[PDB]
Amino acid sequence: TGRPEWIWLALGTALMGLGTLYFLVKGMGVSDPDAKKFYAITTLVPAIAFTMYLSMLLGYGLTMVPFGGEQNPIYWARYADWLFTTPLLLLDLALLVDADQGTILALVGADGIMIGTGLVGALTKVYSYRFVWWAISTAAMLYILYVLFFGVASTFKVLRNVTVVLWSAYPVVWLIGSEGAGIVPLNIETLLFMVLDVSAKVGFGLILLRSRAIFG
């Protein structure tokens, strides 16, 4: 359609949907409560993302934000997506290592500030302030990674580093993309987030559910 990035949105929609179907079928039959837990969590994340990519695709999860003298398309549904899926992803790690509740709360808590401040950064009309919110969000992401390292083992370790490399990519792509300094066109900005999202929402899950660590 009229938006260059549409094919990336259409591809992410498709891959999230297929990933959703795949885990739904994969999950059928699980009777082990613990495994049930990782299956629910892991199936729900691309289901949520599927509906969010579709709203972006259909143009509903998109808005225009004025700044830098320009009218700027902002996909707010990306953040609405992360707002619900990043805490579940952290839930999978939590459950893996059996984190106690104060840690889980701090994690989930830091994550909501991460995405909420980043959504504020996204919608802020004062150009310079957007980077203030990028900074606080990035600070929160770093606390989350800090806990992950200093706050099953082998699978945990695997998903941990996947997480590091994947989650730390989101900050840069924000910065260089159209929501930030405006280094890379929106069209390529959407492509990168799609590739991260699918790796984080489907790839991560394939890696976790194919492991016996999820089993009591």
Add this chain to the structure above:
Amino acid sequence: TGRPEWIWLALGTALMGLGTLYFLVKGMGVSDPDAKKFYAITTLVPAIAFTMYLSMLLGYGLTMVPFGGEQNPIYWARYADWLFTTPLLLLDLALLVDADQGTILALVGADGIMIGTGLVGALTKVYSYRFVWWAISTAAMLYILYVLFFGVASTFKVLRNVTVVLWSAYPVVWLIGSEGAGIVPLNIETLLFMVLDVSAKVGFGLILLRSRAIFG
């Protein structure tokens, strides 16, 4: 007032308020933690709905959505209502049959997508796409009913079928009402949702709390 549907909104407000008072008084004295749980859950649901019908009544939870060439009044507060009460209703069943946590999460998870996609459907300006969101929401509702059947007993069974007949009514009324194909005037569309809501928010609760199944 100026809106035909006002008397239905005023009636739902009144019935939810009275239902709220009734359970609040009913609940006083409960010392059994488990029963306490069903009382809180069941009292909270019409309290939330009371405030939401009032915002609709007062006109705050109402907006106009353009599509089909027309400006269309949409009661978004209906969805804000279901967003918080449908998961608690599912909580009551969950607690009844002592569902494990992976099931509860999948249930609560599918329910949030159900109402969120249906709210997107409600606010979408592209006529044809609204039905796409109706379809995904309906798909999620069907997963929720699927779990309910394939995922205390007697009371469970009773509330289960009440749930089936009541929840499956919401899809049709969306379709034929003004938010969809536009078969039934808004005025009658509001009347039907009010009747469902009160049966689902008060009737359901009367049935559950009058049972000893809620007792350890």
Add this chain to the structure above:
Amino acid sequence: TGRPEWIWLALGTALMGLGTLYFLVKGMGVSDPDAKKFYAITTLVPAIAFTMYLSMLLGYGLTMVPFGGEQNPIYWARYADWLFTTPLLLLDLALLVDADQGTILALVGADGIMIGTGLVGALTKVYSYRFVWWAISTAAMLYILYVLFFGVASTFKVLRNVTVVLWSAYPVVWLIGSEGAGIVPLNIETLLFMVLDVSAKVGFGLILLRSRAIFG
């Protein structure tokens, strides 16, 4: 800047940030899961508030609401703040006295209606109706205080009365401030909420975390 209340917003930002840092450092080393719980909860609350005061300061969490024939600046981010921090504050008391789950739910449930109805009151364009929402919110606050009194001991008692005096201040300041009857200028309205917020978000926490009651 152009807004008189800015210095109060800047002061609250600063005090919440410093309070956040202070507990973060204070919390380092805690290994006792229960204590971990009060530390997470208590550190998260001014972190959330920090980001919300900053959005108010920067002007992002501010909007204009028409009523009384005038265009009226409303800091909606104040409510977005309370929406997440008041339930955690109640969590600290809950955990103190080891409230059972039906109580916690009723508490958290009444609190969300409290702030949500008060946010509706804040954004309502019909002058007289704002006070209807003030009334329902106040009713919910009273239920929350009722439970607190009729629904560790010594610390509980201390935080309980702090809570009473602090939380009951918010209703009056709404009433006399610019969001209500318009008795006190916005500039002083913001000052009072800042003083309450910092006492409720930092002061309360200093009092709780300096106690051994948080320890198993």
